[PDB]
Design a binder for this molecule. Structure first.
Ligand SMILES: Nc1nc2c(ncn2[C@@H]2O[C@H](COP(=O)(O)OP(=O)(O)OP(=O)(O)O)[C@@H](O)[C@H]2O)c(=O)[nH]1
Ligand SMILES: Nc1nc2c(ncn2[C@@H]2O[C@H](COP(=O)(O)OP(=O)(O)OP(=O)(O)O)[C@@H](O)[C@H]2O)c(=O)[nH]1
Lengths: 85, 30, 453, 439
């Protein structure tokens, strides 16, 4: 997964979000994104085994709702549907 | 989380071992 | 799936269209004429994306990813002097071969084949400079013989040099040709290569261009510069979906997936509402139209940029892009009104497609009357009707073989019989294209695969 | 570590004057030789010791000796640099103006007045302790220059067998005098094969072409060519003159560039420069492109053996990595040799006035490929043609070469044979079957 997070950083650099990466505050906002993969399936395809795990930090966590382990996984299922499409 | 966690943990272990080997500046007196 | 696109300016008309398009893109993205971006490099947050079309040599200078190639150095020097530092002097190809020795397609093909190594080396240098790439955009300008020959040579090189890239072309057809024989010969010789290797082709008939420039402009006299301004605005509007990437269409491949049903049917018809970025754009706030009226104007024959000749036209792939503050209820109303007014083939249940783009935050905001504009691209067989004039000229002049002493030089064939055979082959190719179009206009085109499995 | 410059012929004198002016402007020494830097701060990051001897007056005398049969150019250089050079380090042979553009007269003058040059170089060596070798700069076309260069090369190899010798040989362009200058060129080349340790090639035609391309005036001057020679020598010696962490001696550079003493001819290139605008990736791309080399390539895909580049300016590692990947993809290396690509970040001189086009990172590159063999083949072919067609070289000789013309023809045949074996060794190393003795 180190090559995976390196590819993620390279994609962030290549995309239009390179402006947010150049801006220092938005750079920290992007670094707040967790490049964490939850393995799904046994020997499945690289697309299906892919999963995005995002972790908030205060004082943004007290306002924004994310895929918490004890929540409804609304963002998780929305991202899964959009990822299938 | 485990990646950066183990990275920082290895760094902290090395730092603590080096600080303990270097004369142990932490002390308590009476 | 979005990649960078490199612009190919060929011929005098192609170079003028490219210059106008680059000036329009500079005005949109606040880049200006000096090449240095008018916006400070500190405001890095940019909703647009100049990377596919501009090379970021520095943080404040956006060099357009474009190569100009022409035999007349006068227009190239004029463009370079007007746009000081905007263009790259290393991407200007003249070959020092002097002025064109006639308006023959063979001359252009020869001047392209002789210096094919130089233009290919320039393309390779641009490919080395860029990291991502998707395809080129060639400006044919088939009205000029040398320009059409250069475009055909570029196509015949790029097809087998980069087969993994999609190739789009823009062929500008004249309204009334001074020498119809030579101009039809050049257009047919370019159309042969367009059918052979080109993946997508957009036609631009000058009759509707002259009509629009006489209607919307105040001056009765029409100038070629603000005539090509219309084509450049069209190209900028159709590339907006990549420059300011929308949410549905974000790649030229994805656009051509729904715009091109098959490699044989790769000829579209454009239409645009009264423009707002042209010179005389003050008479636009007196119309007071909505998105439904914009769609009506897009579907009207008076706003098409090619000769309509609408005699029960058969549509195959109708697509539209609306730029501005667009309303979904009005879009649905316009779709319901157009699905009951546009002829659809009974063998395909596919309807017209609507896409909504975003307006530039630095472009001059227009009043609520014409703040929203629209572009429409329709796959109609009426392009073969535009070609029918050239085919009839070929059929009525090829009986004798006039002007044969001009196409014999330059090309690889100096004899008359070989040139006659090549012209007959090109005529057969365009006839087969017209037959395929008039067959796809019927329901038996899809039944051909139903009757045999 | 100290290197002594040797200015042979009028070309050598001109390039030495230009190089010393450039080095003075860089290290703040000026034309008067006195330290242009204030005496309040002595902390410096450069290295003027191997090139400048600092006296009690804090004046930096250039460690250079001028050997030429024409005292006029030496007197002109002295007039333009009054108070810079040492009159004791001047050698005019006390024979008046030059006469004869053949290698024979030059070698005879060298063998006659070798005692003076030997005493001069001995005094220059004994003035200090740390020594590594000498530096020669000459044109193989000039007869007296090539003769003096061959004489000094012979003296150095038979006197100091431990000091490494490097030379900068400027080959002539496509002109008329190549019918007789080719003799001097091939004789100097044979001498380099026999004794010299390192050689940097220069083609006058490609030099004039690059000069006319970079300059607005097409009437290129020999002074402009010498100025560009000064610039390329400064860019290639910056690594030694400003050593920070990696490179502090030319020995390591020549070890990583020259793999074998039989292959000791290097092609230089430098871009961009005048006499932010271009990133380091574009600079390395231009270096790879033949339109920025100081020698005529005349090859579609030369067989690169060993290359080494020095980038001057503030450079970041991502563009370096991208350019290195592109170079590994494009440049082809033999299947028996290594694909070594060395990059050295050279610091800029703070005591040097700002060159035009400021903040434009530049790059120099020394390569060992099949571009020198093309020029060598052209030179030896012209020599063979003129020799087998016209017997006129036996009319202008001096000393032993004039006593009998058969020995001259024998020496020329031997030089042709050794350069033929040399180019055969190059064309063999170009193939993978060269190192078949161990595999
Ligand atoms: N509408 C329009 N047509 C143009 C323009 N420029 C050139 N053309 C077309 O070009 C034709 C005239 O030929 P040229 O423009 O000289 O093309 P050419 O003969 O190949 O010469 P070069 O383009 O310099 O190589 C006309 O019939 C026009 O249709 C333009 O700016 N606007
Ligand atoms: N590039 C360059 N080459 C020079 C210059 N001066 C002399 N040369 C070289 O000198 C050659 C011409 O011969 P000469 O100038 O007579 O040199 P020479 O034969 O050694 O005679 P002397 O210089 O008087 O000793 C040319 O081929 C050049 O390579 C110069 O200023 N610039």
């Amino acid at each position: 997964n180190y090559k995976l997070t390196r590819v993620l950083q390279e994609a962030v650099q290549l995309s239009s979000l390179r402006h947010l990466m150049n801006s220092p505050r938005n750079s920290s906002v992007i670094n707040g994104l967790d490049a964490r993969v939850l393995d799904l399936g046994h020997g499945s395809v690289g697309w299906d085994v892919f999963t995005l795990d995002y972790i908030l930090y205060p004082p943004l966590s007290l306002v924004l709702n994310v895929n918490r382990p004890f929540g409804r996984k609304e963002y998780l299922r929305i991202f899964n549907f959009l990822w299938r499409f | 989380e485990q990646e950066v966690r183990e990275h920082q943990m290895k760094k902290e272990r090395f730092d603590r071992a080096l600080e303990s080997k270097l004369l142990g500046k932490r002390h308590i007196t009476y | 799936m979005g990649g960078e696109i490199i612009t190919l300016q060929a011929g005098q008309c192609g170079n003028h269209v490219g210059k106008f398009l680059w000036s329009q893109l500079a005005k949109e993205h606040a880049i200006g004429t000096d090449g240095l971006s008018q916006l400070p490099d500190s405001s890095t947050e940019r909703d647009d994306d100049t990377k596919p079309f501009f090379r970021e040599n520095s943080r404040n200078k956006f060099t357009p990813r474009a190569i100009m190639m022409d035999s007349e150095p006068s227009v190239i020097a004029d463009v370079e002097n007007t746009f000081r530092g905007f263009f790259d002097p290393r991407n200007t190809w003249v070959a020092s071969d002097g002025a064109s020795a006639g308006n023959s397609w063979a001359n252009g093909y020869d001047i392209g084949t002789r210096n094919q190594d130089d233009i290919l080396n320039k393309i390779d240098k641009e490919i080395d400079s860029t990291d991502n790439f998707e395809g080129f955009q060639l400006l044919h300008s088939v009205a000029g013989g040398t320009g059409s020959g250069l475009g055909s040579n570029l196509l015949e090189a790029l097809c087998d040099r980069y087969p993994k890239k999609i190739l789009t072309t823009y062929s500008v057809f004249p309204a009334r040709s001074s020498e119809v024989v030579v101009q039809s010969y050049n257009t047919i010789l370019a159309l042969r290569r367009l059918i052979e290797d080109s993946d997508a082709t957009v036609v631009f008939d000058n009759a509707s261009l002259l009509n629009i420039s006489g209607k919307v402009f105040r001056n009765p006299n029409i100038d070629l510069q603000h005539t090509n301004q219309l084509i450049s605005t069209i190209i900028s509007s159709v590339t907006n979906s990549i420059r300011f990437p929308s949410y549905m269409y974000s790649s030229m491949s994805s656009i051509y997936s729904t715009l091109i049903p098959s490699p044989e049917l790769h000829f579209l018809s454009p239409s645009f509402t009264p423009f707002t970025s042209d010179y005389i754009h003050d008479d636009i706030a007196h119309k007071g139209h909505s998105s439904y009226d914009v769609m009506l104007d897009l579907l009207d024959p008076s706003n098409s940029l090619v000769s309509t000749a609408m005699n029960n036209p058969t549509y195959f792939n109708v697509y539209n892009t609306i730029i501005g503050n667009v309303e979904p209820r009005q879009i649905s109303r316009a779709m319901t009104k157009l699905q009951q007014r546009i002829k659809f083939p009974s063998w395909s249940s596919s309807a017209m497609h609507v896409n909504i783009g975003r307006r530039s935050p630095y472009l001059p905001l227009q009043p609520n009357e014409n703040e929203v504009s629209g572009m429409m691209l329709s796959n109609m067989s009426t392009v073969v009707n535009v070609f029918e004039n050239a085919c009839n000229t070929f059929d009525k002049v090829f009986a004798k073989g006039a002007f044969l002493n001009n196409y014999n030089v330059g090309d690889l064939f100096q004899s008359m019989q070989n040139v006659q055979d090549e012209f007959a082959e090109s005529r057969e190719v365009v006839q087969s294209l017209m037959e395929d179009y008039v067959a796809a206009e019927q329901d038996s085109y899809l039944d051909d695969v139903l009757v045999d499995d």
